[PDB]
Design a protein around this nucleic acid. Structure first.
Lengths: 101, 80
DNA sequence: TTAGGGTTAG
């Protein structure tokens, strides 16, 4: 994707003999890191880190719905809470690779 | 822990407390002798009546609609 | 052998 096929050949005679030297290292494009890879058990702890780090009691029990509940209802309102991270958004966009058993 | 059927269980009305203040209540008794069929028999937990009683409690707990209990919510720890 | 169905008064 980042460098598709079909390029002009890298003719040696040109690369050397030229006075108007142009070559694979004459002019170049910069690059911010594409698609790095993680080891699974680091992906896992990235996740499990952001979870606890973002969990925020007040932000699930907004007032004025709060300030009226019994304690038991309040605790069971809060005793489960998912989250959906979509890594392909991160920078770099962590690709995910492994074996399936 | 087992299941019983109390054949010809007597019911009887109560209306007082130990200090003889009023309180309406229900008594239950089983008079001596088997006449009329007063008795008990252990029920096997393979009996379809026991399946019916189990079925009933399935609603009496999940769909209980009953107030709180086990306020000590730090107690269960599930399969600790 | 007993018991050989029918209301306690608790």
């Amino acid at each position: 994707l980042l460098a598709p096929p079909g390029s002009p050949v890298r003719n040696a005679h040109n690369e050397i003999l030229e006075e108007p030297h142009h070559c694979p290292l004459q002019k170049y494009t910069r690059l911010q890191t594409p698609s790095s890879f993680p080891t699974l058990a680091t992906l896992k702890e990235e996740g499990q880190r952001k979870a606890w780090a973002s969990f925020d009691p007040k932000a699930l029990l907004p007032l004025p719905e709060a300030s009226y509940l019994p304690s038991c209802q309040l605790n069971r309102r809060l005793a489960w809470s998912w989250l959906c991270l979509l890594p392909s958004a991160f920078c770099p966009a962590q690709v995910l690779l492994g074996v399936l058993v | 822990g087992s299941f019983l059927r109390i054949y010809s269980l007597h019911t009887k009305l109560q209306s007082m407390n130990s200090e003889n203040q009023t309180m309406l209540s229900l008594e239950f008794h089983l008079h001596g002798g088997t006449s009329y069929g007063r008795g008990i028999r252990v029920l096997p937990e393979s009996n379809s009546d026991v399946d019916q009683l189990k079925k009933d409690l399935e609603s009496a707990n999940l769909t209980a609609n009953q107030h709180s209990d086990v306020i000590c919510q730090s107690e269960p720890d599930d399969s600790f």
